[PDB]
């Protein structure tokens, strides 16, 4: 079996699981792990590429009584890619060290402090929370403990499956898998809702239209509901800030992806002469990316002039003081497309 001596065929009868892995660059999550976990103890972070690698590193059979095991199984069965495991107490120290991390996923832990510090404008991070573990209060005060952060979202309720025990799967692990699948399939600008949740995962509590009507404004909660013919779906695409900007997850996450991609596109201009020839080169790189993004359908407008604009130059974006200090300033304005959310049927005879 594992000991290979003679050339030929070896027979073994195992029961180890086997799953599949996708590849999405815009969804690279980091899972908060309890410090008591033996696997994560003594290391800054651990990178898991697939279920096969995790099972190899664990050197143990799949345990449904381990919260981290079920979260990774739910995450990988939903189409998630390679992720990072970081202890909860080390989030504010190890996340900035990692460069490709885009999602901050609370795998059942309390990451309220880490989100309030890391998820800020310009950091290119998005947070996924967990909803309350009890029934939703009908007074509309079940979301009072969440900060109005436009870089975070909450999902309710927790999920169960066939391989479940006294502990229930946190919704963040399954949702983060949905992010990877939607981004690789339809792009980051498409809402990560109205999509089935893979596996046998089922919501622990039922949510009706009346219940969701209270928690769809302000600090909105995103529900996971079951419908008579379509199965279990993600019903909600709103962040924690109710504003004409960043109301919807797609708009906030699209800008996060574009800012990261543009930053990588023109990173060649650092430590270059701060003159006009350099500025023209940077403008060409930014305009090339924005046109390609508009072509894919990620921007709103019939022609590129209606979808984006780029400005850079002396007395347009920067002054003499900015140039003498080594600063190069560019302005980018892009229009995002917002989804249809309410469908109204009017019947008459």
């Amino acid at each position: 079996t594992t000991i290979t001596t003679y050339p030929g065929v070896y027979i073994e009868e195992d029961a180890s699981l086997s799953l599949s892995v996708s590849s999405s660059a815009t969804a690279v999550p980091v899972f908060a792990v309890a410090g008591d976990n033996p696997l994560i103890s003594g290391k800054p972070y651990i990178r898991i590429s697939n279920w096969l690698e995790y099972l190899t590193l664990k050197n143990e059979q799949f345990d449904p009584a381990n919260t981290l095991d079920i979260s990774l199984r739910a995450y990988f069965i939903n189409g998630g890619g390679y992720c990072y495991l970081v202890q909860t107490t080390d989030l504010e120290k190890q996340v900035p060290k990692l460069d490709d991390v885009t999602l901050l996923v609370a795998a059942g832990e309390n990451i309220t402090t880490a989100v309030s510090t890391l998820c800020k404008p310009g950091k290119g991070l998005f947070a996924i929370f967990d909803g309350p573990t009890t029934e939703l209060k009908s007074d509309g005060t079940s979301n009072s403990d969440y900060d109005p952060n436009p870089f975070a979202a909450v999902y309710y309720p927790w999920l169960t499956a066939d391989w479940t025990t006294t502990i229930d799967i946190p919704p963040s692990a399954a949702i983060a898998g949905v992010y990877c699948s939607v981004d690789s399939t339809r792009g980051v600008w498409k809402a990560p809702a109205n999509v089935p949740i893979q596996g046998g995962l089922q919501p622990k509590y039922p949510v009706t239209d009346d219940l969701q009507a209270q928690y769809n404004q302000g600090k909105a909660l995103n529900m996971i509901r079951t419908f008579p013919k379509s199965g279990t779906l993600v019903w909600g695409a709103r962040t924690l800030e109710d504003n004409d900007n960043w109301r919807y997850i797609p708009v906030r996450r699209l800008f996060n992806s574009a800012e990261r991609d543009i930053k990588n596109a023109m990173s060649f201009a650092v430590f270059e002469p701060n003159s006009q020839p350099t500025w023209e080169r940077v403008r060409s790189a930014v305009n090339n990316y924005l046109y390609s993004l508009w072509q894919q359908g990620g921007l709103a407008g019939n022609k590129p002039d209606d979808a984006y604009f780029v400005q850079i130059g002396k007395d347009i974006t920067m002054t003499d003081d900015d140039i003498k200090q080594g600063k190069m300033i560019i302005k980018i304005g892009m229009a995002a497309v917002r989804p249809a959310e309410f469908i109204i049927l009017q019947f008459t005879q």
Partner: protein, 148 residues
């Protein structure tokens, strides 16, 4: 009396001073040509004498860059020799009319997603008094003009 500032604003630009950026790197070239845009025409006629003409589909962009042969330099050939089956690294190309000293841009031609299709080596003639010149041919998608 005509001031040099008036010339920089009202006079036309010559062709011999330009700088070419291939990908994220800048390479000196001797000749660049082919930056043309073409469209087809769709026509429709009817019995009572109508005649409609509309623009059709845009054609592909073809580009030829000419460069001299320098010691230890094989960058252009290394690009075309990297084609495996149908995979190749596509690069954006920018050609800019430049200040006589090279410190200011006047007009920029932008070429997106170009990849090589042909490479011509110098012809070795024992009676010639010229410099070895290599030529590369590129196929691209789009061409845009930006005024500085």
């Amino acid at each position: 009396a005509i001031t040099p500032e008036q010339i920089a604003v009202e006079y036309p630009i010559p062709t011999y001073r330009f700088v070419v950026s291939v990908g994220d790197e800048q390479i000196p070239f001797n000749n660049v040509s082919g930056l043309d845009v073409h469209y087809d025409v769709i026509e429709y006629k009817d019995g009572i004498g109508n005649y409609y003409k509309m623009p059709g589909q845009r054609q592909s962009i073809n580009i030829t860059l000419r460069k001299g042969v320098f010691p230890g330099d094989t960058k252009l050939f290394d690009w075309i020799n990297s084609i495996q089956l149908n995979q190749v690294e596509k690069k954006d190309i920018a050609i800019s009319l430049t200040n006589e000293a090279g410190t200011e841009i006047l007009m920029t031609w932008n070429v997106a997603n170009a990849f090589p299709t042909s490479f011509t080596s110098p012809s070795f003639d024992a009676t010639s008094n010229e410099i070895a010149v290599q030529e590369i041919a590129l196929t691209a998608d789009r061409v845009t003009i930006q005024a500085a």
